[PDB]
Each structure stands twice: as structure tokens, then as C-alpha cells.
Amino acid sequence: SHPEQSRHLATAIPGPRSQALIDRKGTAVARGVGTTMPVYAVRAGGGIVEDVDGNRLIDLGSGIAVTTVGNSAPKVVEAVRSQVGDFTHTCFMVTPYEGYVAVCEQLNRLTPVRGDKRSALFNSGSEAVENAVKIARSHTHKPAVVAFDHAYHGRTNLTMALTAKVMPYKDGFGPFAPEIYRAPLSYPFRDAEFGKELATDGELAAKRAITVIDKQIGADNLAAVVIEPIQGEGGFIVPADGFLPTLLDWCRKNDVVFIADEVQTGFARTGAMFACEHEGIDPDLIVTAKGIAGGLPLSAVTGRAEIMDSPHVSGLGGTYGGNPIACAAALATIETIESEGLVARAQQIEKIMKDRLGRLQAEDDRIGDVRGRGAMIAMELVKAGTTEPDADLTKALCAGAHAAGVIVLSCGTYGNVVRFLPPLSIGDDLLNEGLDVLEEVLRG
Amino acid sequence: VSHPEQSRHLATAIPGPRSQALIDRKGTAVARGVGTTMPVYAVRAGGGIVEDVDGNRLIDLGSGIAVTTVGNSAPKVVEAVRSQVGDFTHTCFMVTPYEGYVAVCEQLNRLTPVRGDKRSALFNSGSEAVENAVKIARSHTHKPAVVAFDHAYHGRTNLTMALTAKVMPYKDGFGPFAPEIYRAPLSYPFRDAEFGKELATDGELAAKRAITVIDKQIGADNLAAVVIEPIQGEGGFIVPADGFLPTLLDWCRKNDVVFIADEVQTGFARTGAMFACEHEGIDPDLIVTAKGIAGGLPLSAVTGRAEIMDSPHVSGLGGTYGGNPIACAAALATIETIESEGLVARAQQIEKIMKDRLGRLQAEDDRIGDVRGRGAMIAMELVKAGTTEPDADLTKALCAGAHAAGVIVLSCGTYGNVVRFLPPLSIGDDLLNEGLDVLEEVLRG
To answer: Which of A85, B72, B201, B234 could form a disulfide with B45 if both were Cys (CB 3.0 to 4.6 A apart)?
Structure first.
């Protein structure tokens, strides 16, 4: 039974029980673990998170794009409750189980990779990115990996290296994994300053990136190009059409592994099962996590078999990876997406969000850009009439929204992107109410 | 919760038909690099048994590589998970926090061998937790280098692969690796004895040799941290001579270097103490935990002195899933189970049984060169008779024979010649003795 599907302010935010927990957190948990919301969760589902003080908050974050099928989705709940009674863990590398194999089979069926495929399962998106890189290096016997401006790939030493922004992800945590290189990205809103055409000519932006890659790395030294189809933490940046196709074509001609990092965009989030579908991109490897298992810790790499099978037996794995409870949850998640038509639901949500935010942009020129696909939509805030970022306004907006019982996140290289990641279980009325709150706060 | 029948049972050949069908599916769906030890597919597990799809019931002497210490599907863990999942599966602690995360951190702070004011942070895997302990140490010290030891195992990410000593299969072809990672010599009494019997058990002098390497080849003013397992796990259940860890700790404290105890495998009752640092009264600066922490659910942690832990800036630590609320509920239940079922004492009982059985076997069979470990982390090292030459061939044959007779048993070691025993603390004496009987019978044959 989920919380009542209405916003409710029982107390000030934070309320007293949340504040008590904030004080406990401060004396038990390292300060490096930051928290966005000043409330403590007790129950969640549909479009709501209910806190320890009885407030019900509208969820426009889905736990950073994780609870796409909704928190405590009925199929996930049942799958976890059943499996936990059978076994919690055998370690797949010790005693295997059907759940792991079935999830790999489903990934192989569902992903935009073409031909014969194999998969492997881990826990976090960072681990899965690490394994995609291991796999590419093993297959190609080449060292280098290139990632892009505004990219985010995780918090391990190598995924920090792959990540572009230092504060807070990398600052003081190096030195970082070697032979990682940076290439320029298609970012239409900011590329427009140098030519309206370059803001829309994705093939040309890819050629700029290729020249960097060719000259500064060389295909014969390059294992892999890793890219998010839409940059997530970097600001919900959607590349100009032609950028991803041209990159993939270059990789295919130069024996370089094209790795799509769909940790955030994957599993119905962008109004397709995978965001690579929007331009018909068939990557060599695809990394998945977040929405894959309805909140349970699971991640994966799926890819062309000949690439995936290069690592030697026992060269991939980890103790917990592909946990049987998580696998049960992932199968339940897939079944939920397919049975409830959640890809189409993300499309419906895109229409509502782009309509509402577009009308807002029309009334407020501090909104420089509205962008994204499906239920991954954002607005970038700027000093009116310019592309100068306004992170101060972004912080103010988010703080005001939180005070009014709405969970909303920011992101961006310049800290000035307000993003929207509602779960696909949110109803239209709560989605529209959340956006109403943002409008009211922005007006004041 | 209803665990499988607590008896070994061979319903079919190993593998049976249903397992063979699954082996065939695995081969066409799963990357070959994900290896599997047992040729059987699990359906249910608990107590001291794993039951497979063909109805075979195998004796579990692996606990999923030291994870299901409290037993598979432990009653309190099952209850906690089932309760939590109905409330919420995930909010991201970094977005909307929840009490379970805080409560696990408070419990770690209370139970760990770190002294003074403490803080914790939660992740998913042991590799992630090691990575975090390193990030924390670097942030706090503003020094770059980290030293790990011969025979060390710390994980499968780029940096934890760097920290890990053995290349096959952990590192091979997966570099280049994270920079400013260095290697120092380890106390390994069995193999050190060839070079001096007295020296081999002098852990203080062993530490002094490692400190000389560290001083000369790195320098304290360039070194953020020393990371070490109290008993090396994948490297062979190597127990350092007494005085090694205390002397290393003392040097670190004198030289502003973070001493990181990697208790991913040794932690949470496994060694007959809550934490293995307790056996010599070591108080590390940071301690890494995972595996047994949450009864099989994916969770890991770093706990440490508050002034070190709080060095990273706000939002510098975390990850999307870390400290998942279902895993936190399982951790709280795991801790409660260890206390309520007296599992630390149970680990001590199992130590006695295993060391007595294996010591008798060693007296009768000169191919057993060494029997070592603590608690329910015990191993025997197999050698050519009369020597310390490793016998990986015998190890493999012994493990294969055991698997065919319905016993899950693992190997390890730098030279592939260590048979390890990691029974769950929920195993009955009779099944544990039966599992050991199987190993004996296979070894005789």
C-alpha cells in the first residue's frame, strides 16, 4: 500500500523528527555524504515520498533516475519478498542461479547492440563502467579511453578520471587512472555562440571531436570511446542530430569500441527502451544500472559477444554482482515496463513537461534552454539575454521547491540546470502540481 | 522462513539435467569471463546447505566467499527485507535520506575497533569501500601514494586491481592501472621459515623490513595510506606473525600515514572476534567492511576516525545506490543475529573443530604443509611431500572430487594450492564434520 497520492504539509520542512535525524546523521555519517532534501523518508510510491513527520512530497527525482517504475513497485516488492526467503546470496561465481542468467538473456534481447550478444552483472553504475572499460582493453589490447566534456561516469578512481567535473566528484582524490583523454561535446545551447549552424550540425561537432581523438590519441592506441547518449549530471545535454552516428561510424572504421553509457538514460527513461534508439545507434557495448532493478543494487554491461568474451574466465565479476534478490527485481522491473507500457508513458510525460516548461520559458527569459527526452527533461537558468549561468537562482529555486514539499534536483557543469526525473508511476495531476510549485517559487 | 533439509543428498549426478540446461543457457548469454565454481544451479539455501534445481543438497563450506556468515536467508534478515521493501526500495540517501543508513553507521561506529570519535559511509561492494577508504586518506593527508602488500587482494576496479598483487585472473590485460600504488613485503610464516625459523615468527622484525621498503621507495611524506588485510583472504588465508600489524600501525601513527584495515573478508564474526583487528588489539585509522555485513544483501562501508572521515568536502563521497535501505535493514538484522545467536563464540567453536580435524589429517598426510587461520576462516596449504613446492594440481583435484560428492569447497592462494574453509556460522557440527569427512575421503583416494 503506497502513501496517499497527494502533497501534504503536516509540518514545516524540515519537521522536528527529520531535524532529529539530521542531527544524528551529522554525528554518525561522514560529511562527504551530502544530502539534498532536509527530510527523512519512511514510505514512498506512485509520485510521493512520505517523511517521518507525515509530510507527503511530490517526487520529481526518482532517487536520481532509479525508481522509474515507481518506488516499491508491486512486482518488485513481490519478487524481493519471494526470493529473500529462498536465498540471499550464493555468489554467482561460486554457485550460479537462474536469475542471473535470465537477466543477462533479457538484456541481450532488449538492448540496441546488434548481433550475437553477452552480458555480465555487477552492483553499481561505476562498477559497470569499469567493466566495460576492462572488456574493451582486453578485447582490443589498446590502452586509451576517451570521454567527453560534461561527462559523468562515477566515483571510483577510473570513473572519476572519466568524469569531467572536479567539484565535488574528483577534488583531492587523485592521482587518476592513466591514459584517459577528454574530447569536445555537442552542446547546442552553448555551441550556438560560435554559429547557429554548429549548434545543429552534429556531424560537424563529431568531426571536431574525431580530429582531437585522431591527433592527440590515435586509433591504434585507443581502446574505447565512452559517451552518454544524453549527459546526465553534466546538465541533461542532448547532442545535435548526427553527432552520435558519426562517432559510431568512426569507431567502426577504426577498430575502437563504442561504449554507450546508459546508466541514467536506460530502461524507458527517455521515451524509448534505450536512448540509443532515438537515432538508431547500435553501440558495441552498453552500460546499464539505476532503473534496471526498481531500486535494488544492480548494474550490467551488454555487448557484441566477441568483445564481451575477450576477458579470460574469472577475469570479470565481484562478490555480490548480480545478487539474486536484485535479479528478481530487475526481471520484475522489465515486466512492469512492458506490461504497463511505460515507454509510451515516458513519451506522455515528455509532452507535459516540455509544454509546461516551454510556456514558463516564454514568460521568464532567465530560462535559457529547455531540453531532454521522455522523463529526462531540464531547464538551464541564465542571466536573461545571455548564456551566463545563474547557479544562485538554481539553488534558490530548489530550496523553495523543497520547502513547499517537492523533491527536485539540479545538475550541470555550471550548477545552473534544474532537472526533472519523475518516476513513470507519477499521475498527471501530481506531475502538473509539482510544476505549479516550481512556477510559484520562480515567480517569487 | 523455511530452509532446505539439513542433510547432504545426491539425487542426481553432478551436474543433473536441470543444471545442465542452465549451464547451456549461461554459455550463450553470459560473458565467459564470469567464471563459475560449482556445476549446479541453486534454488534454496540455509543452515549449512545449498539445494540445487535437481534436488541435490550440498554442504556449504564457502558461504558465498565469506558472505552468508549468519546463514543464507537468516530469519531476521528475511523479516527485515520483507518489511522494508514494502515501504520503499530506494530514495538515494544523497537525495532523500532515511534512518536505516544513519542507524547502520551508528552501529558500525559502535562495533568497530577504531578508537575515539568515529564516522562511517556506506557503499555497495567491497571494491567500492576500499576505493573510498583510499579517497578519504588522500583527501585527509594531501599525499598521493598508497602501499599494499604481497599476496594482497582488494577488488576488481582499476584502483583495487592496482592494490591487488596477483595478475591471473584479477588484473591480466586490464590496465594501465591507477598511479602511485606500491607493493611491500608481507609476513607469511610458512614460506618465510625457509629463510630463518626464528625470523619467520618475528612479526615486529617483518614489519621493520616492510617499513624499510616503504621509507626508501615511497617516503612517509609522499604516502597517504597503508592498506592491509588482517588475514589475507584470496592470497591464501595468510595469518601474519604476531607483532607485524601492531608495528606497522605504530609507524603509521608516528608518520602521519593512514592505516587502513581491509576487513571485507575478516569482518563481522568470521574470525572468532567481531573484527579481526581485535586479536592483537589493533585500532586502525580506517576499517573497510563488506561481505558478511548484510547477510547477503549488497552493502559495504568505511568507518574511521572522525577527523579523517570528515576531510572530504560535502558531496565528495557517495554513489547512487550506496547504503540501499533494504540492505541497511538486512545489516541491522545481521548485527542483531550475531549478538542473539552468539556467533562470535560459534566461530571460536568452529575454529577448534576445523583445526583439530585438519591437524589430525596433517599428521597422517605430508602433502598438507600448513594449517592456519582463525574462526571460521581456516585453510590448509598443499605441497609436494617434504617440501614447500606448491601442489595446485592436487588442490584442483581435491576441490573437484568434493564438488562431485555434494560439497561446496573453495581454493585460493598466490600459487593456487590452498584449500579454504568458509562455512556459515549457522552450520551444524554434524554437517561440518561430514563435509570434512568428504574432503578426507577424496584426499585419501
So the answer is: B72
